[PDB]
């Protein structure tokens, strides 16, 4: 992809008001809903469950649940046993339980062939528009950016869903970057972009046996039948040295933002739902909710292959991007799950509320998922190109450098019109197809509005069109 540096363009960026984050959020929701829609609705699963604990033969995250499930025939029912996690199952009425989202919202099963592996998505503007990338190595995330370049589209952004920690994606180029709309505003999230990744080795060691039953004509329900081996619990590992160095870097940058004698405390998420209080992420299609207290358990005072193991609970019924009336069931994956991710950033929330200063406490805050994408789209601003200019003169009637001379003076920027005028037509899953159609129609609409304006001005193909309008000194 051709990136064009804009030599002297200073451009005000605001990642917290960046329309690409709202558009990416809407696109991820639409893609999730479209991939989930043509799948099993699991209406028959909202039954009374007879759940006992999964036991060791001598004596409790998983529960062995017995239900009267429907079959391909409506006059016949089958007794089904299935292992559900405690976090998926709500106790009603001793032994009688039901699924977490059966009293509120509907739970749609993900199709068993659908892959949840994030694949880098390049968000690309239609021709006639461009995306400005901010290359300032220590960029605050807001305000004037001095090193600006233009691209048709961004680097590959993996649509990674994570909460407390940002997994995979871009790292800072020189140092940990603490970005906030207002660091003194405790209602805003603090997006930490690390310059070194912290490797997080995470697994669901359970050798789950996946069973499949029909619950209606063509409706196959996938569930855990049994565990072949020991139950254990899912967990993530980060090394003590790498994580502690990462927190050291974070406190150095926070001390740059706060007083240089401030005590910075990392503490566990003080509350909220599981998507906020734990590090919620997709590991190969399974949904992990890692306690992460052991990461944010430290008081920093201003002056070995030993890993920190984070307990992780697993959920099968997921309500991600919390919405009224929506829920998804993630089918279990046969065998043992292991994934190794890069922690490339953090979402921290400062508590505040104290008049006794010198101590600040930063707790993880899952927040919304617009912050996870903002942490990748922070470099990018969408701008509409206005290729038609008017200026006083003395007349009486490849894509390299596409927006170059934007920060240069006029005249010098009038010698580059040929390259700017070109690539305004072509540039430098129902949902994606409609967005491609909207982008192409919009690009054609703007191209033709500009060519029409040139036509009605008598400038249809001159590129530099001198006219018979005298310049009015009241204009400039």
């Amino acid at each position: 992809p051709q990136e064009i540096h804009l030599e002297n363009v200073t451009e005000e960026f605001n990642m917290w008001k960046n329309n690409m984050v709202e558009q990416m959020h809407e696109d991820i929701i639409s893609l999730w809903d479209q991939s989930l829609k043509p799948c099993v609705k699991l209406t028959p699963l909202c039954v009374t469950l007879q759940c006992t604990n999964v036991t060791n033969n001598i004596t409790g995250e998983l529960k062995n649940c017995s239900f009267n499930m429907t079959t391909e025939l409506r006059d016949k029912k089958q007794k089904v046993y299935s292992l559900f996690y405690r976090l998926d199952v709500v106790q009603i009425n001793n032994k009688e339980y039901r699924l977490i989202n059966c009293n509120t919202s509907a739970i749609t099963q993900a199709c068993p062939k659908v892959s949840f592996e994030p694949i880098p998505i390049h968000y690309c503007a239609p021709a006639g528009f461009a995306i400005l990338k901010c290359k300032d190595k220590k960029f605050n995330g807001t305000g004037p950016c001095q090193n600006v370049s233009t691209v048709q589209c961004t680097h590959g952004i993996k649509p990674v869903v994570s909460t407390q920690l940002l997994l995979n994606g871009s790292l800072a180029e020189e140092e940990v970057i603490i970005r906030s709309e207002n660091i003194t505003n405790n209602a805003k999230n603090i997006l930490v972009q690390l310059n070194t990744s912290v490797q997080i080795n995470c697994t669901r060691p359970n050798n789950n046996t996946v069973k499949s039953i029909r619950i209606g004509p063509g409706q196959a329900f996938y569930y855990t039948g049994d565990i072949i081996g020991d139950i254990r619990q899912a967990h993530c590992n980060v090394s003590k040295a790498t994580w502690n160095e990462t927190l050291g870097k974070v406190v150095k940058q926070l001390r740059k933002h706060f007083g240089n004698n401030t005590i910075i405390r990392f503490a566990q998420s003080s509350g909220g739902d599981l998507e906020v209080t734990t590090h919620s992420f997709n590991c190969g299609g399974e949904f992990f909710y890692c306690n992460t207290s052991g990461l944010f358990n430290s008081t920093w005072i201003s002056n070995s292959n030993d890993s920190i193991t984070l307990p992780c609970r697993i959920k099968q019924i997921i309500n991600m991007w919390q919405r009224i009336g929506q829920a998804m069931y993630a089918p279990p994956i046969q065998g043992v799950i292991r994934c190794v991710s890069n922690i490339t950033g953090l979402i921290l929330t400062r508590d505040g509320g104290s008049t006794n200063s010198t101590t600040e406490t930063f707790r993880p805050g899952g927040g919304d998922m617009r912050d996870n994408w903002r942490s990748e789209l922070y470099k990018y601003k969408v701008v509409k190109i206005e290729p038609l200019g008017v200026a006083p003169t003395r007349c009486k009637r490849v894509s390299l450098g596409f927006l170059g001379a934007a920060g240069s003076t006029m005249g010098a920027a009038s010698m580059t019109l040929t390259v700017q005028a070109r690539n305004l037509l072509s540039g430098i899953d129902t949902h994606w197809g409609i967005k491609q159609l909207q982008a192409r129609v919009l690009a054609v609409e703007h191209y033709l509005r500009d060519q029409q304006l040139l036509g009605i001005w008598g400038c249809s193909g001159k590129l530099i069109c001198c006219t018979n309008v005298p310049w009015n000194s009241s204009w400039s």
Partner: antibody, heavy 127, light 106 residues
């Protein structure tokens, strides 16, 4: 993987008892919970306490205040000190490897006690 | 503590059932030891695997409510011994040990 004990032949009444146990030719003594038991001859057997290489210790709550257990991490030897033991408290003292088998991550509690498989001997030393 | 009968008596060739019970025995594994006079109380029922206790053996153990039964198959004169059960506390703050049951074969 053998256990051999050591201690005095006689102790004074109401005096501190000191016993030791030597672990021979094992491969991973750091995994197991090293423990002592006390038995009154002809009567019930009871556990007195244990210690792990990670510094954790446990003691029988009825005895805890008078019993201290230590291990040497350099020389594989397991020591027991019991303050002010008398005839009504004493009995044969045995050392054992309350073996621990690890099934998952020990930091997460995913280990289960296997039991006192390998045992030494003991003498009801008193007065 | 874990209450045990003071003695049990079976004929040779029969299956012996030595039991113990107590509150912490409902949530923690029960280990069993066989002590001969003059010898150490070696293990007979050990824990192996987190979800079974199993273990190919002549012996075997059954968990039922607050009572745990040690089932000894093919009892012979060689099995005469003091049998003890052990279990950890519900918070694993200490190990609780039973008083023992004397098994005689007559």
């Amino acid at each position: 993987v053998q256990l051999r004990e050591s201690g005095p032949g006689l102790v004074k009444p109401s005096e501190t008892l000191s016993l030791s146990c030597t672990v021979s030719n094992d491969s991973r003594p750091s995994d197991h919970s090293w423990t002592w038991v006390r038995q009154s001859p002809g009567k019930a057997l009871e556990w007195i306490g244990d210690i792990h290489y990670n510094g954790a210790t446990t003691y029988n709550p009825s005895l805890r205040s008078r019993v201290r257990i230590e291990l040497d991490q350099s020389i594989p030897r397991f020591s027991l000190k019991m303050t002010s033991m008398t005839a009504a408290d004493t009995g044969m003292y045995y050392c054992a490897r309350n073996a621990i088998r690890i099934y998952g991550v020990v930091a997460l509690g995913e280990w289960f006690h296997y039991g006192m498989d390998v045992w030494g001997q003991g003498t009801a030393v008193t007065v | 503590e874990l209450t045990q009968p003071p003695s049990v008596s079976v004929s040779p060739g029969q299956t012996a059932r030595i039991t113990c019970s107590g509150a912490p025995l409902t949530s923690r594994f029960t280990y069993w030891y066989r002590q001969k006079p003059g010898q150490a109380p070696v293990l007979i029922i050990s824990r192996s695997s987190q979800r079974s206790s199993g273990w190919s053996g002549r012996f075997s153990a059954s968990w039922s409510g607050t009572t745990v039964t040690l089932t000894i198959r093919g009892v012979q004169a060689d099995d005469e011994a003091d049998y003890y059960c052990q279990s950890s506390d519900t918070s694993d703050s200490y190990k609780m040990f039973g008083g023992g049951t004397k098994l005689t074969v007559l």
